[PDB]
Structure formats: C-alpha cells, structure tokens
Amino acid sequence: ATRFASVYAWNRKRISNCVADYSVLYNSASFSTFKCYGVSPTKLNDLCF
Amino acid sequence: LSRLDPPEAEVQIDRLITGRLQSLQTYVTQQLIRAAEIRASANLAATKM
Numbered sequence: 001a002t003r004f005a006s007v008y009a010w011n012r013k014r015i016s017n018c019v020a021d022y023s024v025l026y027n028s029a030s031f032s033t034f035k036c037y038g039v040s041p042t043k044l045n046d047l048c049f
Numbered sequence: 050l051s052r053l054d055p056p057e058a059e060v061q062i063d064r065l066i067t068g069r070l071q072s073l074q075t076y077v078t079q080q081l082i083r084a085a086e087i088r089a090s091a092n093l094a095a096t097k098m
Contacts, residue, residue: 038052038053039052039053040052040053040054040057042054044051044052046051047051047052
C-alpha cells in the first residue's frame, strides 16, 4: 500500500475467500520484526481460518 | 501439535500432562478406598453365609 494510516486511526481490513502462501511473506527477507503468537510461521499455513 | 513448534509445544504438553496425571491419581485413590469398603462388605456377606 502506498499510503499508511496513523496509529490512532489504524487501518483495518478483512480478508476471506482466497488462498494465501504465508511462507512467501515469511520468506521475503524484507521485514525487520516477524513474531507469531499461538502459531509458528514456519510452514504452518496448513490450516483453515 | 499441529500449530506450534516443539520448543513451546513442550510447555503446553507439560501443562496438559500435569493436569491429566493429577486427575488419574485422584481417581485411583478414590477407587482404592471404595474397593476397601466393598471388601469389608464382602467379608461380612461371607460371614453371614
């Protein structure tokens, strides 16, 4: 996204009805911080949400 | 098992193991006491016979 919202007006979007390869986003080597709670990002995209 | 890596699955499974083991010990002790009472009654019945 080109423009990001302010923190007090944090933007929310809802995503459903699609297929996502979370490993790609994980294996992007582009993020400073990447922490998952309740789940381990390393190839646990094998579940339905 | 399907949502976490082993390092934290260890903690979670430890909690579950602790709880279930304590439940089993409670159940077994109750059964031992009840069996003692039943044996006393059975001895009385044999004596009456």
